[PDB]
Amino acid sequence: IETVPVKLKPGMDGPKVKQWPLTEEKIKALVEICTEMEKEGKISKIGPENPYNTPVFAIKKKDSTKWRKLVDFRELNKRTQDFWPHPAGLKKKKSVTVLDVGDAYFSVPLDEDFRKYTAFTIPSINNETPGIRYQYNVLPQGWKGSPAIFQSSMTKILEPFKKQNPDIVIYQYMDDLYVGSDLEIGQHRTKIEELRQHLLRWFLWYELHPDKWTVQPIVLPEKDSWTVNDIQKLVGKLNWASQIYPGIKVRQLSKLLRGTKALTEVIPLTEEAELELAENREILKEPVHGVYYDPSKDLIAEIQKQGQGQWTYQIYQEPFKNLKTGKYARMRGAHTNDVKQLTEAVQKITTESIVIWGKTPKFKLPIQKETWETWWTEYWQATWIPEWEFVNTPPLVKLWYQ
Amino acid sequence: VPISPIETVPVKLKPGMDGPKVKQWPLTEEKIKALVEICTEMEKEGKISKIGPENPYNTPVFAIKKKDSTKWRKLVDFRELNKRTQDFWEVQLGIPHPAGLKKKKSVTVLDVGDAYFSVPLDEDFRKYTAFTIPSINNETPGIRYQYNVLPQGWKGSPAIFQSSMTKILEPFAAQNPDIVIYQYMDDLYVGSDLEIGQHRTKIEELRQHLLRWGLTTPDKEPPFLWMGYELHPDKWTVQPIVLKDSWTVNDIQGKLNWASQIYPGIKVRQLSKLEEAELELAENREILKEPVHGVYYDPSKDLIAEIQKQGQGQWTYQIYQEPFKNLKTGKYARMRGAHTNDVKQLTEAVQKITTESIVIWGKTPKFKLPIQKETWETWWTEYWQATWIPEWEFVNTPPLVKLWYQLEKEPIVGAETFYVDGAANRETKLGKAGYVTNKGRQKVVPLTNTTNQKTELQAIYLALQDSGLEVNIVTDSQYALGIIQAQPDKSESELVNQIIEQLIKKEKVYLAWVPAHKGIGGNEQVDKLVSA
Ligand SMILES: C=CC(=O)NCCc1ccc(Cl)c(Oc2cc(Cl)cc(C#N)c2)c1
């Protein structure tokens, strides 16, 4: 009931980010939503004395048809004062469920002097009327201070469930609660239904699990007949992997390509060449040497489009030091829409990153800036938004992860 | 009759900055006499109030004769206070576009300019608006004044005023959804499709509603001249536009970009000045000679957008709901870059038109595009980037966008294999480019004024020139791969354009990459030849 004093970081003004265009349906949904939040006192209209702004738009979460208000607090979160633990068990758990606990934030007042920086604008079509300007009175969904400030209340609500179930790992990131287990889904959902019940006894009606390899092994072909082209591709892949792995050698394989030969011609492997290829296999079976996570440095996520709905990704902090690699093969929403697939890949990769390290990575997207910025909000279903940059030059490496 | 007050808008100065302390300029006795007369009337009207000696702030006041009508006009120069006043959320950054307006049967104008001086200024801020009328012969203390209302020329006045008018009109617009109200200058524009009797009645209700806040309305005519447009009841168009060895002064005209929104086929690619410059090699569009008007928006009909390729990285589009009646038109210029193709540019035009249409009509239009469905499918399924264009249909209006070549995914059986390499000396700018093949074909060409990158491209060109219709090419040039894998159809480098022209003639091309200096036999032999 007593607000926590919050201030921006030293030497930084409040956010002043342009509101981007919205469709009529999203504007109509945002009006209905904000009209009701106004009556509930969560937000209040503001005047021209407020120069600050944060973009707003609308989404439909997974398996629901109801519009939800999403605010892009990325700029405010950067400039918000760092407010002063990550469970390594969450990644190791067999099954983790994700719960939207954001509505809980709306029962906590926001510091009076800080409300000015939560200002948002509902745009008008064709600029025909002025924008509807609001600011928050309660803790906003998507703000980094909202979990921080609410943490004191959250532990109190969850200590009963935690004592009753100690094997359950519980983790909170933004509006999301991550609840891990090693039990069966039916009882998992039963314990999950139990957690919601505690939440109803002050909330909304995602099932995920870890996969086998953290870093997917590099694999080489096993053939009985090698063409010149097969051996050229292999030498290329091994030269690339030699930037990651120490003792990769290609001399005995490159020697087979001696002469000016037709690409489709079969070349039998020499005994020296078979041994070299086997030693490289052995090298690639071991882990990468000296790969550490540093919480100070940013995480970097790279995505390649491999075609036919397949996508590859690598998370790292230093080049050739992969903390995780993976491959996403099917996106149900879009066999005809590359951008929907990419957007769902970014969301899956961010979720995994939240589980493993408890922070989102910076993405390098295989897309032109203008195409991505036009369409990603149409397919976004998460309450957080990561950072991203754009790759304009085709990487030669796409082959090596294929 | 009690009048509801206009709630003041709390204003503050920027943090750490204090108010203005500028020097009042010496005035002529005639000007001082003119200012004293004005301010006494303004004071009698409540717009300003005389202040005592306590206020330490001052803003200079000037007098300008208005068209020598034997009358003077007061001018207070708030430039300094504006620099020290807080920032505001201005709301006029985007103007409505006429093509987004809906047709209306009746549209009435009302004068609400009297409301500007009816909007109060924050009490605690008035002391910062102080100004001094100098005394005759400087023998008395000048008359001191401060503002009680939003001053003309102050930073906050435009934003505070509109936000005040909107707060006033909200009950009326909510309770009368059968009407629309737009605010331009000192006049309000109210439109409706009701019978002329009901429309005039509701205007009387608006005048009554404004009278509650004391705003009093007096007792134009279509077409309306607004923001460089002409707004007729059934059509809209731009206001007239106007254009020698003096063209050297500027390319600010040129302003055909403003015309481009309704006049089709306008081009501005002359790109001169890419303060005195030569001009040559240009075409007068001269399509501005004949009048062209746009239509208003009917939300019950579909929105359509058709794009045409005009050449030289230029694209033109029309947005319409019914055939041959255009809501608006426009153009798109290719982005500055070294290599490009038509499919990427058409994709960027689609995205530009999409966002503009969201702005103006709140929805994406259906597209008609000069590209075959099969062409687009081949493109996006094989393009290394993710791409997408919204719902669209093919229109057979040449020039048609097409794919000009497609590289093979696998080596070609029975096609000759060309191993190419190129190298140059950084100091002499001399180099070699060449190939060796599986059939024993060879070439090495000596080159002057070249780089390692140009020799790598030239070697690929040689293999393409001297090969049959089907050919396998092995290079170690990551630079050449990055270029060809981006599928350019045109380039700024004439060497890339020549490779493109050779690729268009081939039936099958497989381009394979190998690492350099690793002993790949064909690459090793040609590398020794070209690095000599
Ligand atoms: C006579 C023309 C006509 O009727 N056009 C139909 C569109 C239309 C509808 C409703 C109104 Cl209120 C309107 O008036 C405006 C709008 C705007 Cl942006 C600016 C101005 C001004 N200066 C007036 C226009």
UniProtKB/Swiss-Prot annotation, chain A:
Changing residue 157 to V: 70% loss of DNA-directed DNA polymerase activity. 64% loss of RNA-directed DNA polymerase activity. This is p51 RT. Changing residue 177 to V: 22% loss of DNA-directed DNA polymerase activity. No loss of RNA-directed DNA polymerase activity. Changing residue 375 to L: Almost complete loss of RT p66/p51 heterodimerization. Complete loss of polymerase activity. Changing residue 231 to T: 96% loss of polymerase activity. 45% loss of RNase H activity. The chain holds residues 604 to 1027 of 1447 of the full protein. Changing residue 146 to A: 74% loss of polymerase activity. 56% loss of RNase H activity. Changing residue 176 to E: Drastically reduced incorporation of phosphorothioate nucleotide. Loss of pyrophosphorolysis (reverse of the polymerase reaction). No effect on RNase H activity. Changing residue 177 to I: 29% loss of DNA-directed DNA polymerase activity. 46% loss of RNA-directed DNA polymerase activity.
Swiss-Prot record, chain B:
Changing residue 415 to I: Replication slightly delayed. Heterodimer of p66 RT and p51 RT (RT p66/p51). Heterodimerization of RT is essential for DNA polymerase activity. The overall folding of the subdomains is similar in p66 RT and p51 RT but the spatial arrangements of the subdomains are dramatically different. This is Reverse transcriptase/ribonuclease H. The chain holds residues 600 to 1153 of 1447 of the full protein. Changing residue 168 to T: 34% increase of DNA-directed DNA polymerase activity. 18% increase of RNA-directed DNA polymerase activity. Residues 45-231 form the Reverse transcriptase domain. Changing residue 186 to E: Strongly decreased RNA-directed and DNA-directed DNA polymerase activities. No effect on RNase H activity. Changing residue 223 to A: No effect on RNA-dependent DNA polymerase activity. Complete loss of RNA 5'-end cleavage. No effect on RNA 3'-end cleavage. Changing residue 420 to S: Slight delays in replication. Changing residue 221 to A: No effect on RNA-dependent DNA polymerase activity. No effect on RNA 5'-end and 3'-end cleavages. Changing residue 418 to V: Slight delays in replication. Virions contain primarily p51 RT. Changing residue 416 to N: Virions contain primarily p51 RT. Residues 412-532 form the RNase H type-1 domain. It is found in: Virion. Changing residue 379 to L: Almost complete loss of RT p66/p51 heterodimerization. Complete loss of polymerase activity. Error-prone enzyme that lacks a proof-reading function. High mutations rate is a direct consequence of this characteristic. RT also displays frequent template switching leading to high recombination rate. Recombination mostly occurs between homologous regions of the two copackaged RNA genomes. If these two RNA molecules derive from different viral strains, reverse transcription will give rise to highly recombinated proviral DNAs. Changing residue 187 to A: Strongly decreased RNA-directed and DNA-directed DNA polymerase activities. Loss of pyrophosphorolysis (reverse of the polymerase reaction). No effect on RNase H activity. Changing residue 75 to V: No loss of polymerase activity. No loss of RNase H activity. Mg(2+) 2 binds at residues 421, 456, 476, 527. Residues 224-232 are annotated as: RT 'primer grip'. Changing residue 168 to L: 80% loss of DNA-directed DNA polymerase activity. 23% loss of RNA-directed DNA polymerase activity. RT is structured in five subdomains: finger, palm, thumb, connection and RNase H. Within the palm subdomain, the 'primer grip' region is thought to be involved in the positioning of the primer terminus for accommodating the incoming nucleotide. The RNase H domain stabilizes the association of RT with primer-template. Changing residue 392 to L: Almost complete loss of RT p66/p51 heterodimerization.
